[PDB]
């Protein structure tokens, strides 16, 4: 029912240096990537259900194919294999949750919401949330 | 010696081992060992006086600097120093750093020319990184 479909570019970033030190990330990449990662541009296919959704910067460009409720894998921001299940968590909202393939680490999830117009990304690790907004271009 | 020039990266050697040395955890030393696989270099030098930019399309660095003279900069992983270069040899730039904020290794520099090649040393504490440069 909602419309993610479309070309997005980021407005806003809170909290992203923040979620990648919750994530064990060293300063040395922390500081490129949120130079780099500070205008992220984003893809967006999406069938009923079915979503293509890719992020690009110069730095690391990513694209996950899913169906809300089916599973599949991707990577955590930090680059761990990861296999996620989203969900609708309400008519504008998906919830993801993630389980890492390989090792330890604290808990990661991301929410993606259209609230007028605006599509609001949410990252959590454990008690840390990031919120980037991205508006259409 | 004549250090000024355009010059390209053409081999590598320990630069995983010299991160882990200066406490980068793996996943960020995969991507860095990555990003850093073929800068490109421009030289300037006028007697001592040197200037140094180092190109990756993630990140780039310049340094301007008198042989004998402190300079500010930052280490491999970007942590702020204080640094001095002397001439080590007629073809030899030895730069030694001190951190400006927290403790960490003994980090250094050297930058040779051998046979027109630009061999760049970094160390940090018994961990040696070569990088081996040639002109564009
Ligand atoms: C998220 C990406 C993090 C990338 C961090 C790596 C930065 C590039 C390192 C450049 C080292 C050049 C050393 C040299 O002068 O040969
Ligand atoms: C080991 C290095 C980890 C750093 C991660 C870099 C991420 C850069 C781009 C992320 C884009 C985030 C977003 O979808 O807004």
Not at 22 to 41: D, E, T
Not at 70 to 83: P, Q
Request: glycine share 6%.
């Amino acid at each position: 029912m909602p419309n993610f479909a479309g070309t997005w570019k980021m407005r806003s970033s809170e909290n992203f240096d923040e979620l990648l030190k919750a994530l064990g990330v060293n300063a040395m990449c922390r500081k490129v990537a949120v130079a780099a990662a500070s205008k992220p541009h984003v893809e967006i296919r999406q069938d009923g259900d079915q979503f293509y959704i890719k992020t690009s910067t110069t730095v690391r460009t990513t694209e996950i194919n899913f169906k809300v409720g089916e599973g599949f894998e991707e990577e955590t921001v930090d680059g761990r294999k990861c296999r996620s299940l989203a969900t609708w968590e309400n008519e504008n909202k998906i919830h993801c949750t993630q389980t890492l393939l390989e090792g330890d680490g604290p808990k990661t999830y991301w929410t993606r919401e259209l609230a007028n117009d605006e599509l609001i990304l949410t990252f959590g690790a454990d008690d840390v949330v990031c919120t980037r907004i991205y508006v259409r271009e």
